[PDB]
Design an enzyme around this catalytic site. Structure first.
Site, mmCIF file in Angstrom:
data_model
loop_
_atom_site.group_PDB
_atom_site.id
_atom_site.type_symbol
_atom_site.label_atom_id
_atom_site.label_comp_id
_atom_site.label_asym_id
_atom_site.label_seq_id
_atom_site.Cartn_x
_atom_site.Cartn_y
_atom_site.Cartn_z
ATOM 1 C CD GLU A 1 3.867 5.761 -9.804
ATOM 2 O OE1 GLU A 1 4.711 5.737 -9.337
ATOM 3 O OE2 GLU A 1 2.561 6.043 -9.186
ATOM 4 C CE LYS B 1 4.875 -18.200 8.198
ATOM 5 N NZ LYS B 1 4.414 -19.592 7.673
ATOM 6 C CG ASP B 2 0.537 -12.136 10.024
ATOM 7 O OD1 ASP B 2 1.012 -12.668 8.710
ATOM 8 O OD2 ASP B 2 -0.720 -12.067 10.317
ATOM 9 C CB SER C 1 -7.792 -19.141 5.382
ATOM 10 O OG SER C 1 -7.747 -18.046 5.964
ATOM 11 C CG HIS D 1 -14.091 -13.324 10.116
ATOM 12 N ND1 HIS D 1 -14.271 -12.304 11.016
ATOM 13 C CD2 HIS D 1 -12.915 -13.459 9.923
ATOM 14 C CE1 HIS D 1 -13.185 -11.493 11.073
ATOM 15 N NE2 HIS D 1 -12.264 -12.513 10.560
HETATM 16 C C1 HEM Z 1 -6.492 -3.319 -0.191
HETATM 17 C C2 HEM Z 1 -6.811 -4.408 -0.656
HETATM 18 C C3 HEM Z 1 -6.828 -5.889 0.106
HETATM 19 C C4 HEM Z 1 -6.755 -5.979 1.308
HETATM 20 C C5 HEM Z 1 -6.518 -4.856 2.691
HETATM 21 C C6 HEM Z 1 -6.810 -7.543 1.435
HETATM 22 C C7 HEM Z 1 -6.885 -7.977 3.064
HETATM 23 C C8 HEM Z 1 -7.020 -9.346 2.956
HETATM 24 C C9 HEM Z 1 -6.951 -9.943 4.292
HETATM 25 C C10 HEM Z 1 -6.228 -9.271 5.562
HETATM 26 C C11 HEM Z 1 -7.299 -11.047 3.874
HETATM 27 C C12 HEM Z 1 -7.071 -12.557 4.821
HETATM 28 C C13 HEM Z 1 -5.686 -12.942 4.692
HETATM 29 C C14 HEM Z 1 -5.906 -13.793 3.637
HETATM 30 O O1 HEM Z 1 -6.712 -14.579 3.359
HETATM 31 O O2 HEM Z 1 -4.762 -13.860 2.777
HETATM 32 C C15 HEM Z 1 -7.508 -11.496 2.430
HETATM 33 C C16 HEM Z 1 -8.074 -12.440 1.972
HETATM 34 C C17 HEM Z 1 -8.438 -12.504 0.637
HETATM 35 N N1 HEM Z 1 -8.474 -11.486 -0.050
HETATM 36 FE FE1 HEM Z 1 -7.868 -9.630 0.145
HETATM 37 N N2 HEM Z 1 -6.885 -7.994 0.474
HETATM 38 C C18 HEM Z 1 -6.793 -7.058 -0.609
HETATM 39 C C19 HEM Z 1 -7.012 -7.184 -1.900
HETATM 40 C C20 HEM Z 1 -7.520 -8.489 -2.365
HETATM 41 C C21 HEM Z 1 -7.963 -8.304 -3.820
HETATM 42 C C22 HEM Z 1 -7.593 -7.074 -4.818
HETATM 43 C C23 HEM Z 1 -8.257 -9.437 -4.208
HETATM 44 C C24 HEM Z 1 -8.932 -10.187 -5.423
HETATM 45 C C25 HEM Z 1 -8.882 -9.415 -6.499
HETATM 46 C C26 HEM Z 1 -8.450 -10.219 -2.899
HETATM 47 C C27 HEM Z 1 -8.807 -11.416 -2.566
HETATM 48 C C28 HEM Z 1 -8.832 -12.250 -1.355
HETATM 49 C C29 HEM Z 1 -9.027 -13.636 -1.273
HETATM 50 C C30 HEM Z 1 -9.528 -14.475 -2.322
HETATM 51 C C31 HEM Z 1 -8.728 -13.831 0.005
HETATM 52 C C32 HEM Z 1 -8.955 -15.032 0.746
HETATM 53 C C33 HEM Z 1 -8.041 -16.125 0.130
HETATM 54 C C34 HEM Z 1 -7.791 -17.375 1.043
HETATM 55 O O3 HEM Z 1 -8.350 -17.189 2.437
HETATM 56 O O4 HEM Z 1 -6.979 -18.384 0.955
HETATM 57 N N3 HEM Z 1 -8.010 -9.453 -1.631
HETATM 58 N N4 HEM Z 1 -7.559 -10.266 1.791
HETATM 59 C C1 HEM Z 2 -3.922 3.919 -0.220
HETATM 60 C C2 HEM Z 2 -3.377 5.089 0.300
HETATM 61 C C3 HEM Z 2 -2.597 6.054 -0.532
HETATM 62 C C4 HEM Z 2 -1.906 5.860 -1.789
HETATM 63 C C5 HEM Z 2 -1.862 4.723 -2.547
HETATM 64 C C6 HEM Z 2 -1.466 7.210 -1.987
HETATM 65 C C7 HEM Z 2 -0.586 7.566 -2.883
HETATM 66 C C8 HEM Z 2 -0.195 8.554 -3.015
HETATM 67 C C9 HEM Z 2 0.860 9.017 -4.219
HETATM 68 C C10 HEM Z 2 1.277 7.627 -5.532
HETATM 69 C C11 HEM Z 2 1.124 10.055 -4.347
HETATM 70 C C12 HEM Z 2 2.250 10.728 -5.293
HETATM 71 C C13 HEM Z 2 3.732 10.536 -4.927
HETATM 72 C C14 HEM Z 2 4.431 11.694 -4.886
HETATM 73 O O1 HEM Z 2 3.874 12.526 -5.556
HETATM 74 O O2 HEM Z 2 5.569 11.539 -4.585
HETATM 75 C C15 HEM Z 2 0.642 10.532 -3.029
HETATM 76 C C16 HEM Z 2 0.535 11.834 -2.865
HETATM 77 C C17 HEM Z 2 0.014 12.410 -1.670
HETATM 78 N N1 HEM Z 2 -0.808 11.838 -0.727
HETATM 79 FE FE1 HEM Z 2 -1.268 9.904 -1.155
HETATM 80 N N2 HEM Z 2 -1.538 8.148 -0.885
HETATM 81 C C18 HEM Z 2 -2.520 7.574 -0.011
HETATM 82 C C19 HEM Z 2 -2.961 8.062 1.020
HETATM 83 C C20 HEM Z 2 -3.063 9.249 1.225
HETATM 84 C C21 HEM Z 2 -3.450 9.828 2.390
HETATM 85 C C22 HEM Z 2 -4.716 9.061 3.420
HETATM 86 C C23 HEM Z 2 -3.166 11.214 2.385
HETATM 87 C C24 HEM Z 2 -3.732 12.202 3.234
HETATM 88 C C25 HEM Z 2 -4.257 12.049 4.551
HETATM 89 C C26 HEM Z 2 -2.556 11.555 1.396
HETATM 90 C C27 HEM Z 2 -1.920 12.599 0.869
HETATM 91 C C28 HEM Z 2 -1.319 12.776 0.077
HETATM 92 C C29 HEM Z 2 -0.657 13.984 -0.381
HETATM 93 C C30 HEM Z 2 -0.876 15.360 0.056
HETATM 94 C C31 HEM Z 2 -0.007 13.842 -1.675
HETATM 95 C C32 HEM Z 2 0.909 14.959 -2.132
HETATM 96 C C33 HEM Z 2 2.277 14.894 -1.462
HETATM 97 C C34 HEM Z 2 3.161 14.494 -2.479
HETATM 98 O O3 HEM Z 2 2.684 13.850 -3.575
HETATM 99 O O4 HEM Z 2 4.131 14.915 -2.261
HETATM 100 N N3 HEM Z 2 -2.259 10.111 0.631
HETATM 101 N N4 HEM Z 2 -0.314 9.793 -2.390
#
Ligand code: HEM
Ligand code: HEM
Ligand code: HEC
Ligand code: HEM
Ligand code: FES
Lengths: 67, 49, 62, 49, 81, 379, 144, 106, 109
Positions: free
Chosen positions: F271, F227-228, F205, F201
């Site tokens: 995977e 658009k989002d 951007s 902020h």
């Molecule tokens: C769960 C992971 C992430 C979330 C929720 C997230 C979310 C966001 C959001 C909502 C924005 C503002 C919209 C935008 O600028 O595109 C943003 C900007 C950005 N994020 Fe993340 N992002 C994630 C992961 C990452 C990662 C892994 C990277 C780099 C390794 C990254 C780098 C950036 C950059 C460079 C910007 C600004 C780019 C620009 O403004 O042109 N983000 N991110």
């Molecule tokens: C970024 C957030 C999350 C990711 C990437 C994620 C990813 C996963 C993945 C890859 C599995 C295994 C998929 C499968 O076994 O079919 C899994 C299973 C599970 N996740 Fe998450 N999860 C997230 C958030 C959560 C949250 C917030 C909860 C609880 C509130 C949760 C509870 C579970 C449970 C209980 C399982 C076992 C159920 C199952 O695998 O069948 N996960 N999750």
């Protein structure tokens, strides 16, 4: 009785070129093996490549011919 | 390194997108289980429901 | 000339934002009642004799 | 000077109901807007179900 | 500070626009568009395609070279000796 | 600000970090992955929750319970399938969200990038642990490999592993942990996210041409909010279409069998989204040196900002700097399929080749490419 | 498991519940497997229980072939055929591995018919709002 | 070790300039540059007539990129005409910091 | 604010909501329960966590498992006792934190 639909459909496909064609190699391999069976050799490899080309034809025909 | 053949894809009454299963044939399909598979291979995960 | 179906419609409904909201509710209300009923037949018409709905007639009430 | 400004033609983008120069916009206006909202309110129906 | 007030200084730049109602949601979408897609599809395609092409060859070539090795045992060493 | 309702609770002035946040005019769809990460994140936690209510963590129970969901629970089958496939549709977003990062040179923002790096690095941990929870065959051995791999550390290695396991092997207490972690940990990601968004902020951007956009800005409410949403909608299909018609397609692991420590499956892989990392490893014959590469694989993303070698930010104007970049894409794509293959000699050599190339592009070529073009344009 | 294995001569019968989705290749694996039993090629040996079948990975299976023409009689009375019998099973298991099957595709259809509306409609609005931007005109009129 | 390839360079550079789009939007070589601290001060010193005509090209640049369209190629910039106007200012600011940075060594 | 390290990451200016937050001079000890709620809250979540790692939710298991903590786990008995009693020491704070509310008429906010 009932003869199955299967075996009937089996023979028509193996009447195709590549079926009999590859089947030749079977005799070729085996008849050689028939002499050379003492060696590690087996024709199973060749048996397989026969089976694949066979069933691809078998794929379409009989599943229709079923009930 | 055994050559693994692949099953040639047969048509299936359920193969299509919106295709369904044929229940009529299933009744038979179950009857077989009770007859043959009863010997050794079991199914733990299903009720009479 | 009489107003086109919209020209009426806009004046009667979409003007007042209340009605403009209300009409939406009743709209989805009737919508799901008719819509869902059609979707089944189309699907069901695809599979005939593959469902107890038809199949069950052979054995149901003996 | 400043008054040399003159507005370009947007005719391509308009829709012909308002195309004429000599007409009151207020005749088409009623329905003209009446369509746009119909799009919006229609959309909300889907989300609703 | 506050975002919009102080951003930058611009001078003598005039803007015109119409209500969204007066104008249309599709000003010759297909007619004016479909050429526009093409002229901007080609500008990149020179820079994009070639590397992927290299991959697919490797992939195909890779499988074949792989296949001959394993599947046919009596290939380099036949069953005589 | 007379009777503007945006002041009166203060918290809403904090909510004018969205609505009037000024933005560039021209923005490609490639910037929609800002939001679509968030929504793919929320949609987890809920659907991630209602799984928890029926799941049970025990060596004896766990697998039985997952059976119990798909069978007996009303609407129980959709959720498990939304959750799992809701993971893959999470990464496929995530990578793109990095890709936009490089190719427009957004990494110039120096802090927001870093917090980007960590925020990635965490997810890869979470989406791992959960994958153990079903306690199926591919979960058991896929657990041993990754962890036992860590023993490479010269001295403390032997203890440090046994510590996490809480024993000699992967039996119970190793499971119960990986539930209590995989549960809490996403909340922390949500914690960082509201930081990772903060610094942004301040500077606003970037925009596709790589030019300071100051003269041209737009309110965020009427325009990009639609658009989002439009962006938010196309996800659902891409999520639904997959999860509904073809459940197991991307569900590539075929193994539901209850884990037996004695047996071993012939082929073992993570995977899909992990593979390429796991492919890097097989290359190095030397074990210890092997692990470092895998750790060094991602971290290099942090060093990229030091390598900004040219006088203009974008890669949309540098043909060379654009030419190479795409080769890197196939290079990764290569690694993916490589690791997904057995370790016979036609494959073996290849991975070793693609390995060096990968670094050579990032770490040598690209920083050189900018140098020449400065010289070309007479800069 | 032991009393299971013992009678099986060291072999372990797997559970059949989800075995469809377990093995690779889908159900076709099973059908053609039970179908295929061949004669051992020349120059290959097997253990007594083990029988040569190509599809099975080791191609030596302790399962004696269950099926011959008409092992049973059907509740229906349709002739019992090694081919007819086999397929009828390979449908059953497919139902056990996903009992929700026939139910889910309803939405599969019913969401599409739903979804045909929105995407254009939403895409209708988007251009409506933005239509003011894409209609811009600029002119630079310096007193210069 | 470049002589004919040098005569081939200007086929690439002088011609390369044709292969980088910013010729086709109406921009120049200078207005492209990634902003940095010097440029921040380099900008200040530009008199009006240059400065605004630096603005308008951008303001016209961006808008076009919104509509995904490109100027009529009659009105594209011509490599023979390259306005360097930035350099004569910019070398100052780079120079004058060298002195402090060095004078403060010892 | 010349080279004051409090600006440079912005997040630290958010952290001058504490340090320079001006306060009254005279403040009775009764206003300490502002903090002591927080710390009683944090001290939960941790000690609330390391219980989770060995707990199991099942009708058959659960009670057995709590047995299993107090007996077999190294330092397993302190934690369960910090957690439970860490609840009561949470309320006894909490009520006071309301009591100060009325008797000085803080509810005016
Ligand atoms: C769960 C992971 C992430 C979330 C929720 C997230 C979310 C966001 C959001 C909502 C924005 C503002 C919209 C935008 O600028 O595109 C943003 C900007 C950005 N994020 Fe993340 N992002 C994630 C992961 C990452 C990662 C892994 C990277 C780099 C390794 C990254 C780098 C950036 C950059 C460079 C910007 C600004 C780019 C620009 O403004 O042109 N983000 N991110
Ligand atoms: C970024 C957030 C999350 C990711 C990437 C994620 C990813 C996963 C993945 C890859 C599995 C295994 C998929 C499968 O076994 O079919 C899994 C299973 C599970 N996740 Fe998450 N999860 C997230 C958030 C959560 C949250 C917030 C909860 C609880 C509130 C949760 C509870 C579970 C449970 C209980 C399982 C076992 C159920 C199952 O695998 O069948 N996960 N999750
Ligand atoms: C003679 C007892 C017996 C009969 C009856 C029997 N099975 Fe088998 N079957 C076995 C055993 C034991 C195995 C596994 C042996 C092995 O894997 O070497 C096996 C193998 C299988 C396999 C493959 C197992 C694997 O390892 O992939 C399937 C599937 C199977 N049986 C299903 C069936 C079906 C369908 C029927 C009814 C036609 C049936 N069984 C009847 C004993 C039997
Ligand atoms: C305000 C925060 C919390 C309060 C007031 C609280 C209160 C309690 C109480 C009263 C009990 C029952 C005490 C007992 O059975 O001896 C309990 C048990 C438990 N709490 Fe919490 N707790 C809190 C936070 C947490 C957290 C953050 C976790 C997990 C990280 C947690 C996990 C557990 C578990 C697993 C139990 C069962 C263990 C047991 O009761 O012996 N609690 N908690
Ligand atoms: S560690 Fe045992 S195979 Fe790689």
């Amino acid at each position: 009785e009932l003869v199955d639909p299967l075996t009937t459909v089996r023979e028509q496909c193996e009447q195709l070129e590549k079926c009999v064609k590859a089947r030749e190699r079977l005799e070729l391999c085996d008849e050689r093996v028939s002499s050379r069976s003492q060696t590690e050799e087996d024709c199973t490899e060749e048996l397989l490549d026969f089976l694949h080309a066979r069933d691809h034809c078998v794929a379409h025909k009989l599943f229709n011919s079923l009930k | 390194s055994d050559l693994e053949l692949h099953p040639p894809s047969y048509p299936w009454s359920h193969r299509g997108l919106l295709s369904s299963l044929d229940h009529t044939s299933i009744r038979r399909g179950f009857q077989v289980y009770k007859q043959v598979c009863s010997s050794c291979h079991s199914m733990d995960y299903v009720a009479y429901r | 000339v009489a107003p086109t179906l919209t020209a009426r419609l806009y004046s009667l409904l979409f003007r007042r934002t209340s009605t403009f909201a209300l009409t939406i509710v009743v709209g989805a209300l009737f919508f799901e009642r008719a819509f869902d009923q059609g979707a089944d037949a189309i699907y069901e018409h695809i599979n005939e004799g593959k469902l107890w709905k038809h199949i069950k007639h052979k054995y149901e009430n003996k | 000077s400043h008054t040399d400004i003159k507005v370009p033609d947007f005719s391509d983008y308009r829709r012909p109901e308002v195309l004429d120069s000599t007409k009151s916009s207020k005749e088409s206006s009623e329905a003209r807007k009446g369509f746009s909202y119909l799009v919006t309110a229609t959309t909300t129906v889907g989300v609703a179900y | 500070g506050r975002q919009f007030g102080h951003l930058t200084r611009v001078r003598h730049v005039i803007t015109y626009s119409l209500s969204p109602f007066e104008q249309r949601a599709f000003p010759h979408y297909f007619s004016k568009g479909i050429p526009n897609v093409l002229r901007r599809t080609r500008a990149c395609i020179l820079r994009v395609a070639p590397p992927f092409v290299a991959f697919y060859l490797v992939y195909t070539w890779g499988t074949q070279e792989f296949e001959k090795s394993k599947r046919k045992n009596p290939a380099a060493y036949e069953n005589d000796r | 600000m007379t009777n503007i309702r945006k002041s009166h609770p203060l918290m809403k002035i904090v909510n004018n970090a969205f609505i009037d946040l000024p933005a560039p005019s021209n923005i490609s769809s490639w910037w929609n992955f800002g939001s679509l990460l968030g929504i793919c994140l929320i949609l987890q936690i809920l659907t991630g929750l209602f799984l928890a209510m029926h799941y049970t963590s025990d060596t004896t129970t766990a697998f039985s319970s997952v059976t119990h969901i798909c069978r007996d629970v009303n609407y129980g089958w959709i959720i498990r399938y939304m959750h799992a496939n809701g993971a893959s549709m999470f990464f496929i977003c995530l990578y793109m969200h990095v890709g936009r990062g490089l190719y427009y040179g957004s990494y110039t923002f120096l802090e927001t990038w870093n917090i980007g790096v960590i925020l990635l690095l965490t997810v890869m941990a979470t989406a791992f642990m959960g994958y153990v929870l079903p306690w199926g065959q591919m979960s058991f051995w896929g657990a041993t490999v990754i962890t036992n791999l860590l023993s490479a550390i010269p001295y403390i290695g032997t203890n440090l592993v046994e510590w996490i396991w809480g024993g000699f092997s992967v039996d119970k207490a190793t499971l119960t942990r990986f539930f209590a972690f995989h549960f809490i940990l996403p909340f922390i990601i949500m914690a960082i996210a509201m930081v990772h968004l903060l610094f942004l902020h301040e500077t606003g951007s970037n925009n596709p041409t790589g030019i300071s956009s100051d003269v041209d800005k737009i309110p965020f409410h009427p325009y990009y909010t639609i658009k989002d949403i439009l962006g938010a909608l196309l996800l659902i299909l891409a999520l639904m279409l997959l999860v509904l018609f073809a459940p197991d397609l991307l569900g590539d692991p075929d193994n539901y069998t209850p884990a037996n420590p004695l047996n071993t499956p012939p082929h073992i892989k993570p995977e899909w989204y992990f593979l390429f990392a796991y492919a890097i490893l097989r290359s190095i014959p030397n074990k210890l040196g092997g692990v470092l590469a895998l750790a060094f694989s991602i971290l290099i993303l942090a060093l990229i900002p030091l390598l900004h070698t040219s006088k203009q930010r974008s890669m949309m104007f540098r043909p060379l700097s654009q030419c190479l970049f795409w080769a890197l894409v196939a290079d990764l794509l290569t690694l993916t399929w490589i690791g997904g293959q057995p370790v016979e000699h036609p494959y073996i050599t290849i991975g070793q080749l693609a390995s060096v190339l990968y670094f050579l592009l990032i770490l040598v070529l690209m920083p050189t490419a900018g140098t020449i073009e400065n010289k070309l344009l007479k800069w | 498991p032991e009393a299971a294995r013992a009678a099986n001569n060291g072999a372990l019968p797997p559970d059949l519940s989800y075995i469809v989705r377990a093995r690779h290749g889908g159900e076709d694996y099973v059908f053609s497997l039970l179908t295929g039993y061949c004669e051992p090629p020349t120059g290959v040996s097997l253990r007594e229980g083990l029988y040569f079948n190509p599809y099975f990975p080791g191609q030596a299976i302790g399962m004696a072939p269950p099926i011959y023409n008409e092992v049973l009689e059907f509740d229906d009375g349709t002739p019992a055929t090694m081919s007819q019998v086999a397929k009828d099973v390979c449908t059953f298991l497919r139902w056990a591995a996903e009992p929700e099957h026939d139910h889910r595709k309803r939405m599969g259809l019913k969401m599409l018919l739903m979804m045909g509306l929105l995407l254009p409609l939403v895409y209708a609005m988007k251009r409506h709002k933005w239509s003011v931007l894409k209609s811009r005109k600029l002119a630079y009129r310096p007193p210069k | 070790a470049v002589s004919a390839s040098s005569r081939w360079l200007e086929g690439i550079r002088k011609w390369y300039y044709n292969a980088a789009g910013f010729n086709k939007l109406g921009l120049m070589r200078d207005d492209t540059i990634h902003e940095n601290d010097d440029v921040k001060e380099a900008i200040r010193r530009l008199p009006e007539n240059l400065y605004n005509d630096r603005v308008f090209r951008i303001k016209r640049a961006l808008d076009l990129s919104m509509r995904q369209q490109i100027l009529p190629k009659e009105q594209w910039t011509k490599y023979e005409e390259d306005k360097s106007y930035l350099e004569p200012y910019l070398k100052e600011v780079i120079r004058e910091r060298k002195e402090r940075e060095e004078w403060a060594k010892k």
